[PDB]
């Protein structure tokens, strides 16, 4: 019952695969985080003029 001799004689197989190249997505998520910093400094500048008349 169930016999199938799959054969998995690939033990202690390699865990690492590529040369940390997947980091391409880590560079895109860091670029998207820098664009959200430039717009926050424009809107803080517009609010200083309503409290001076």
């Amino acid at each position: 019952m169930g016999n199938f001799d799959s054969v998995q004689a690939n033990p202690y197989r390699p865990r690492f695969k590529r040369f940390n190249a997947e980091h391409v997505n880590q560079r895109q998520n860091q670029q998207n985080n820098n664009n959200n910093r430039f717009d926050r400094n424009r809107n803080r500048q517009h609010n200083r003029f309503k409290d001076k008349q």
Partner: protein, 268 residues
């Protein structure tokens, strides 16, 4: 359709011969040939080529993508000059002398040390007449020491992303540092090694000054092709691979000298 080394050449270079059966790790049964009816331990040639191709494949993506590979061979004299030869051919960091404790895990202190080496070297290159004779000779000797023990590590500024080990047994410190820091390490196991420590095992010899040289150049050849300079032994025919056996009975691989292991001094 990709090719590689030749099967006749592996048999003739003695890369399918391990060490004496008395000295063997029970965890290496997968690669060993029908040793059940055999004298000295050996390996399978098909498994050898597959493992070699995998290690070759892995090192090439790293070297093409601008990784930093470190070679550490501080064993037989031949191996030091062997490791030196790859350094001349490719601008890879090397550790030919003794592996300092914490070369990787405590990289900060060794980074400070190599920075001191570089700073002292450049001041001396700039020169001055104040150096005179006595202090200059003393200063030259410290400089000599930091190249002999850090001459191949000065180039790199960050932890390497891969290690190539000649003997996992002899470099137990190096492989332990690689394992704890989760860095790939490849090694040439010789029937007496724990497979957990190494990542890409490449069943081969380690006592023959011919098998060792052939395999080390093959890995260097992957790096050299990735770096875009012509290869030396990989993807090459018969006429150009022939190599000689170093001098200093006959080149072999039997492990003896057992009489130098008596009982630990005891009694009362």
């Amino acid at each position: 359709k990709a090719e590689l080394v030749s099967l006749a050449k592996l048999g003739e270079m003695r890369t399918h011969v391990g060490m004496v059966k008395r000295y063997w790790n029970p965890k290496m049964g997968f690669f060993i040939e029908p040793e059940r009816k055999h004298n000295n331990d050996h390996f399978v040639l098909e498994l050898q080529r597959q493992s070699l191709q995998t290690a070759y494949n892995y090192v090439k993506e790293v070297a093409q993508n601008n990784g930093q590979i470190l070679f550490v061979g501080t064993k037989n004299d031949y191996v030091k000059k062997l490791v030196n030869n790859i350094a001349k051919r490719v601008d890879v960091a090397f550790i030919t002398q003794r592996w300092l404790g914490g070369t990787l895990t405590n990289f900060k202190t060794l980074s400070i040390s190599i920075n001191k080496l570089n700073k002292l070297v450049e001041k001396q290159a700039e020169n001055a007449a104040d150096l005179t004779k006595k202090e200059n000779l003393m200063l030259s000797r410290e400089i000599e020491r930091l190249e002999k023990f850090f001459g191949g590590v000065k180039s790199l500024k960050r932890l390497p992303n891969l290690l190539i080990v000649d003997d996992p047994v002899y470099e137990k410190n190096a492989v332990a540092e690689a394992n704890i820091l989760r860095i790939p390490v490849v090694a040439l196991c010789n029937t007496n090694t724990n497979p957990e420590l190494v990542d890409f095992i490449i069943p081969a010899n380690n006592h023959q000054p011919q098998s060792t040289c052939l395999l080390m150049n093959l890995l260097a050849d992957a790096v050299a092709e990735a770096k875009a300079m012509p290869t030396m032994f990989a993807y090459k025919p018969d006429e150009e691979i022939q190599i000689e056996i170093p001098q200093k009975k006959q080149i072999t691989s039997q492990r003896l000298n057992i009489t130098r292991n008596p009982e630990v001094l005891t009694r009362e």
